[PDB]
């Protein structure tokens, strides 16, 4: 039973990473929302 989550770090950083979030207007919107709510972990 090959489950859905196959962990990997390079993929995670290239998809949900910080430098990827600060690469488009929408990503910066996401970061602004996260900051406003006050979360302790902005990106992945």
Does the footprint of RNA cover residue 41 (CB under 7 A)?
no
CA distance 2 to 14: 23
Among 6, 10, 39, 40, binds RNA (CB under 7 A): 6
Contact 28, 22 (CB under 8 A): yes
Residue 40 interacting with RNA (CB under 7 A): no
Taking the C-alpha atoms of residue 9 and residue 15, their distance in angstroms, rounded to an integer, is 10
1 versus 41: smaller Cβ distance to RNA: 1
Which residues are near RNA by CB under 7 A? 1-2, 4, 6
């Amino acid at each position: 039973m090959k489950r859905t989550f196959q962990p990997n770090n390079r993929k995670r950083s290239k998809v949900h990473g910080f430098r990827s979030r600060m690469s488009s207007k929408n990503g910066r919107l996401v970061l602004a929302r996260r900051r406003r709510k006050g979360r302790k972990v902005l990106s992945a």
